[PDB]
Amino acid sequence: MTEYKLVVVGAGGVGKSALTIQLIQNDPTIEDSYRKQVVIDGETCLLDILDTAGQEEYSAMRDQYMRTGEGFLCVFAINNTKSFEDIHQYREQIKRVKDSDDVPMVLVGNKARTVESRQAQDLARSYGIPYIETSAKTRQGVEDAFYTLVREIRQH
Amino acid sequence: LLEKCIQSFDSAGSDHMLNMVLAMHSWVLPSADLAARLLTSYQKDTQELRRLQICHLVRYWLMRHPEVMHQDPQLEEVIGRFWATVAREGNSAQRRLGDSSDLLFDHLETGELAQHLTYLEFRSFQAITPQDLRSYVLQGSVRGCPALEGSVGLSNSVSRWVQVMVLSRPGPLQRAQVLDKFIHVAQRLHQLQNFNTLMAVTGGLCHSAISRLKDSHAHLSPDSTKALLELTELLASHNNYARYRRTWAGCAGFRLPVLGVHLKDLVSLHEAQPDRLPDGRLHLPKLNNLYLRLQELVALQGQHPPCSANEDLLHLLTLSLDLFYTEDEIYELSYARE
């Protein structure tokens, strides 16, 4: 089949681990629990997903998962303006490690709220990447986001 | 279940559950409410005996986690009310109150550099508090918790120091000699089973600002390139670091500087299963897995290194690490050299 290397980037406390879990299972220590065999657009594929929970702080690990990673979910929480402000430096670091202006990624809002969807879409259009919003708890608009990134990789 | 879980017994001094409850309750149920539960359950057929059991549990848990009162005026208030209440009864002969309220830089060699770095990494690691890990899992940022901040800054400064140490040399051959030396250092760190500093040094080697220097990797020895490939394969992201985990399982004795991936795992186990069930009661197995995964780290904090080192030389190396370079200047220099 085809194996896709997905990385979930974003600040802590946005629920990126909770969403990543909601995608797969219904034990993360083992290698199985961050791998999901699913069929997309006719053909089967393997999603090798990597959460960045504790790995953000270490610059070396940051570069390893950026160099190995094929697609990125730049996640933020709609009720946290600063979480939305960090995505810029996320994108710039990814650009330096990949040395390209066309990097496969998808901007994701998650979880009242202090960020309006218009702002996030303006940024996503500002650097030509799709934009989706999710609810990791109930609605789980998750498959749409991950599969959007998968299609972004396939069409690179 | 709160009344059902608190029912941990002490025969005037005597469990696993008890340890779990006292260490892990703060994750889900706030501690001030637990102390209020103890005070309220205090007042209860010939059961001054169990009132003494309660006093012994309070004394035990305050002595085991002496940190439950720095950040929590509410808990301090409720336990003060508790001891004042016991002192205000006067019976039970509980002296628990009166006993309670009281230019060249590295002429070193590979093994010595590895051992001094390991000694630093272990000393900074050992200062990490489990409540720092609690704050990391809950808050989402290390911030406001200095010990692990110093650990992560230590690793970041190791990587920065490796990069700037390679780039400080004119020519691809000089840099290639530096690369040979650091690959040997990484080999010795693998032999010593220090995987955290091994990650820092390897990523400093595998950093994008360094990996782009093709002439240097051309002069790099083929055996050195092979070892570097095997190490990057070891610390790689594939299968949530399955190769790293296979080794970590296959290590023994003093294998124990660990990686921040444990942090990751904690966060995973935090969001995988819910804190509390819809019944209103909370399910313990989550907290048990968390508690044993943390006690692993504490047990690692316990042991002693096999190798010794020169404290003043440690000071010199620490002073060598604290430079001030950003990814910006590092990339500018790497670009200036190719």
Author numbering:
A (entry chain B): 1 to 26, 33 to 117, 122 to 166
B (entry chain A): 61 to 74, 79 to 108, 112 to 169, 195 to 430
From the paper:
One family of these GEFs is comprised of the Ras guanine-nucleotide releasing proteins (RasGRPs) that can activate Ras or Rap, of which there are four in humans. This module consists of a Ras-exchanger motif (REM) domain followed by a Cdc25 domain.
Instead, we determined the structures of the catalytic modules of two other members of the family, RasGRP4 and RasGRP2, bound to nucleotide-free HRas and Rap1B, respectively. Comparison of the structures of the RasGRP4:HRas and RasGRP2:Rap1B complexes show that nucleotide-free HRas and Rap1B are bound in a similar fashion to the two RasGRP proteins, and that the binding mode is similar to that seen in SOS:HRas and Epac2:Rap1B complexes. The sequence of the linker is conserved between RasGRP1 and RasGRP2, but is drastically different in RasGRP4. The sequence of the REM-Cdc25 linker is divergent in RasGRP4, however, and the sequence of the EF domain indicates that RasGRP4 is unlikely to be regulated by calcium. We then processed the data in a lower-symmetry space group (P3212), The final model contains six copies of the RasGRP4cat:HRas complex.
